[PDB]
Amino acid sequence: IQPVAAIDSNFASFTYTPRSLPEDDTSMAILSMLQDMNFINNYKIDCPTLARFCLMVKKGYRDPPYHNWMHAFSVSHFCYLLYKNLELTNYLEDIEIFALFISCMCHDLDHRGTNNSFQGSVMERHHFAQAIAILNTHGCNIFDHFSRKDYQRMLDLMRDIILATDLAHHLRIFKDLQKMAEVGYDRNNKQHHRLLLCLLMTSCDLSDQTKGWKTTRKIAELIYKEFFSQGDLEKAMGNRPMEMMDREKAYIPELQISFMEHIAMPIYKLLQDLFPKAAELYERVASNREHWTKVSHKFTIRGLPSNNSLDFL
């Protein structure tokens, strides 16, 4: 188990981009993060079992453009950053933070690059079921020495956290999140623990928006590749895809800016309200959104297309 500092001197910073790490080093980085959070010693996790678990989780991701292992790794890395930078131990129990990290690793398992509509929370229930199947694969149960009580806690936490990655769920609990942010977190309120875990999970899921322009632009490319692939499949089946899935109707600037203003930014705003040290995350999302507005004009073709042809009219 490599010490975290040996991966990169900036590895525990909010400025670090985990997609910079080559894919063949990510499983070792997962182990290094768990070691640095002390969960291996805390929960007496068998290291061979943990290695097998991590590789099985990695193998349980398919290779669509966005919802692949590197997404899961990047989300898990952000969870680690929240631990290292926001001092989550003042707000959550060790088992809750451990569940959050493991949920991050597992939360999109077996994603096919299609959404719930293409198939409540259909995909998120599947991701959880896949995580369960891995745990019950011989040699991969990292929790098999847990007490009956802690085992059920861990399974309940993982289910609730993975289910919180559905936008529909987030929108249902949004008023409860705002209320908590307003009144202030209460470490003795079990609802506040549950709500905070949901918020943190969504903050990890969307963490590509908190990096530089390069990341938000490149991830947008992967996202729209996935969306439009789904729309193509829907059209081939004879069905009418939503505008954001239809490459002949989708207008990326509008879709991207709306997503950032109305979904991403309010999550990082809430996170800022609960953790002053999360302020730089909200500012980076707002900055990236401003950048999207600035480059919106580039979707209007100036000159001729690269084709050198007006056949498209």
Added chain:
Amino acid sequence: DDEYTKLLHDGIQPVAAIDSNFASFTYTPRSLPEDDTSMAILSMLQDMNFINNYKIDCPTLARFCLMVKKGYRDPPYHNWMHAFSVSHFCYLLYKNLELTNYLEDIEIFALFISCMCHDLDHRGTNNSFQVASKSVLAALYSSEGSVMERHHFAQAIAILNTHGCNIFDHFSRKDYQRMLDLMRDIILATDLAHHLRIFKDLQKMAEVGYDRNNKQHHRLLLCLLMTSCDLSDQTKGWKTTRKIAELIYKEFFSQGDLEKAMGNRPMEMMDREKAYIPELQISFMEHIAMPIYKLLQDLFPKAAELYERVASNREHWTKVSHKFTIRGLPSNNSLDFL
């Protein structure tokens, strides 16, 4: 010799044999293969009776036509097929508007020959570029204005004074000078700057009515007709206007690239990173092309269909303007362009 032999040993084809619709405003001369265009030029001159009228030596005319064809380079738009299409339109105006009621035979003959010659040795660059690039043409003509148009005329003169190519060498001294003066004035009228200077005079003439005894009206009409021929790709169907726009913008943006490489700032319409084709195309059509065909309609009621076609093509450009906004990802499948 080979192109000559083919032009000379294929006899002067009657125009009807080229196409049954050859004398119609709906005909697209770019549909004719390039290897048949020289014979078509001869057929048109024969059908307008200029060969018999002026007793033109047919071998000399064949040589002249092939030399003119050879004097065009191959940029995207300003090539022989442009000159041919412009000459064809001049022929259409003769066949459809009865130009013999307005102009002298020598004036109509000069117009057609001017159409053939009017962009000779064009390099796909405009007058401004010649000055900016300090070309040989700028050195020769920049103090006089209309740099390229003076060059086109000089090229036409050089062809006429090439042995075996002087189609006017049996003209009287009076008719020879007249022909050279007409060719100069008509070729100079293809500069947009010239057209914009005379525009108020053209409007005046259109309003008061053409007067066949007014020599200024003859001169103004020839200018208008020449510009009507130069822009005649706008009077055909959507396919032509769209395809010609492609060639035009390729030429414009190639020039802008050269200007940037020289360190200069190109006009927005020459800059592929700033030019917005719908806006440029619609403005050109509304403010340059349509008023020319409006004037032509005012002077010739039978030219009404030309104006209507230009206005219709402009409406089509407005309708497809929205397609210049990228929906989905680019064909590249990449957002690197941001």
